């Protein structure tokens, strides 16, 4: 059960900090941004303390980790040539960083937002951006994230993902990241028919491309397109369904990353749920009082 969470690189520990945090949640994998998620803005490869972080991951059994590219990257942009160009450039640097970790195979990327050009146009730009980024001999894939359909996001259906993959010439370097919150919010019934939804994914996109799993419950109903994550089992997806995904027989080798919200109503401040959530999902039974246990620790 390859399972972990979003963690942080603090600097100057950087990578060592990510790995300690993950270890402290009892995590077997984890996910990092290379930098702040909301900007671009990055320390050189030399300052990521990779040797030390890799040493601590060996010692505590972590073999693979995930990278998520910052979410301001929009290679779907058609009106500001420099935003498109900025995304190509950064992805090129990001592949270099990630490569420079030894042991991240994947960079999660929000495909893009068409921001008024409509999906077709946005998707053609993403193909174009990707075709400018990718090399046939790069050693890390880009994992296109399943999007919730919020605002003008492209990647909101499997058909949109597949369309992007078919567009790019080095598509062997493309994977996908299946986020449970997003797919639910985008209207797929992963609650009483995840097996069906997986089959569809396999037909449209192909299950071998499903290389990252984001395990989030959701604050909103199916189809809401709101991308508001919730703690495991306390949302609209619920424990049975999330548990089923986590332990799915076809997904044993794929790393599961919780991106669930920290806990602490409402003037504090503000505790990570990952340790307890992970163990609850291992235990196979819903802990009605998990939120109150998360608050003390």
Question: Which residues are at the interface with Zn ion (CB under 5 A)?
Answer: 145, 179, 214, 227
214: annotated binding-site residue? yes
Residue among 55 and 248 whose Cβ is closer to Zn ion:
248
Residue among 185 and 287 whose Cβ is closer to Zn ion:
185
User: How big is the CA angle at 153 (ends 148 and 159), to the nearest 5 degrees?
Assistant: 75
Phi-psi region of 95 (alpha: psi -120 to 50; beta: other; left: phi over 0): alpha
Helix (H) or strand (E) holding 131: helix 119-133
Helix (H) or strand (E) holding 62: none
217-218 and 229-230 strand pairing: antiparallel
Question: What's the closest the beta carbon of residue 109 comes to Zn ion, in angstroms?
Answer: 8
Residue among 21 and 185 whose Cβ is closer to Zn ion:
185
Residue among 14 and 257 whose Cβ is closer to Zn ion:
257
Residue among 62 and 69 whose Cβ is closer to Zn ion:
69
- CA nearest to 197, candidates 185, 187, 189, 209: 189
User: How big is the CA angle at 224 (ends 220 and 225), to the nearest 5 degrees?
Assistant: 110
Could you give the CA distance from residue 166 to residue 35 in angstroms, rounded to a whole number? 30
Residue among 227 and 277 whose Cβ is closer to Zn ion:
227
Specify the length of the chain in residues. 297
- CA nearest to 146, candidates 191, 205, 85: 205
288: annotated binding-site residue? no
> How many other C-beta atoms are found inside a 10 Å radius of the C-beta of residue 288?
10
CA atoms within 13 A on the CB side of 83: 17
Question: What's the closest the beta carbon of residue 255 comes to Zn ion, in angstroms?
Answer: 13
Question: What's the closest the beta carbon of residue 142 comes to Zn ion, in angstroms?
Answer: 12
DSSP label at 189? -
229: annotated binding-site residue? yes
SS3 142: strand
145: annotated binding-site residue? yes
Question: What's the closest the beta carbon of residue 108 comes to Zn ion, in angstroms?
Answer: 6
259: annotated binding-site residue? yes
Per the structure block, which two tokens stand in for 131?
A: 């075709």
Question: What's the closest the beta carbon of residue 56 comes to Zn ion, in angstroms?
Answer: 25
Residue among 123 and 186 whose Cβ is closer to Zn ion:
186
Question: What's the closest the beta carbon of residue 296 comes to Zn ion, in angstroms?
Answer: 27
Q: How many helices (H) and strands (E) does the chain have?
A: 10, 12
Question: What's the closest the beta carbon of residue 287 comes to Zn ion, in angstroms?
Answer: 23
Which residues are documented as binding site for Zn(2+)? Answer: 68, 110, 145, 179, 182, 214, 227, 229, 259
> Which residues fall in the annotated binding site?
68, 110, 145, 179, 182, 214, 227, 229, 259
């Amino acid at each position: 059960l390859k399972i972990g969470s979003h963690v942080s690189m603090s600097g100057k520990k950087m990578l060592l900090a990510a790995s300690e945090e993950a270890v402290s949640y009892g995590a077997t994998t984890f996910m990092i941004y290379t930098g702040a998620p909301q900007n671009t803005r990055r320390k050189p490869i030399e300052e990521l303390n990779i040797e030390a972080g890799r040493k601590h991951m060996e010692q505590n059994g972590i073999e693979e980790i995930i990278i998520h590219a910052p979410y301001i990257i929009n290679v779907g942009n058609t009106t500001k040539p420099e935003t498109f160009q900025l995304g190509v450039d950064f992805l090129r640097m990001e592949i270099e960083r990630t490569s420079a970790l030894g042991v991240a195979k994947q960079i999660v990327l929000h495909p893009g937002a068409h921001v008024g050009a409509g999906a077709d146009a946005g998707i053609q730009q993403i193909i174009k951006g990707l075709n400018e980024v990718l090399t046939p001999d790069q050693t890390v894939n880009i994992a296109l994230e399943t999007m919730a359909g919020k605002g003008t996001e492209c990647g909101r259906s499997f058909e949109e993902i597949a369309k992007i993959i078919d567009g790019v010439k080095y598509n062997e370097k493309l994977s996908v990241c299946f986020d449970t919150c997003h797919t639910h919010d985008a209207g797929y019934d992963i609650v009483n028919n995840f097996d069906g939804v997986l089959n569809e994914f396999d037909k449209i996109v192909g299950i071998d491309r499903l290389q990252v799993l984001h395990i989030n419950d959701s604050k909103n109903v199916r189809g809401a397109g709101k991308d508001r994550h919730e703690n495991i089992g306390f949302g609209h997806i619920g424990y049975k369904a999330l548990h089923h995904i986590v332990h799915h027989p076809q997904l044993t080798h794929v790393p599961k990353i919780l991106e669930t919200p920290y806990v602490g109503e409402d003037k504090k401040d503000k505790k990570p749920p990952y340790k307890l959530e992970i163990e609850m999902l291992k235990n196979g039974t819903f802990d009605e009082g998990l939120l109150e246990k998360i608050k003390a620790q």
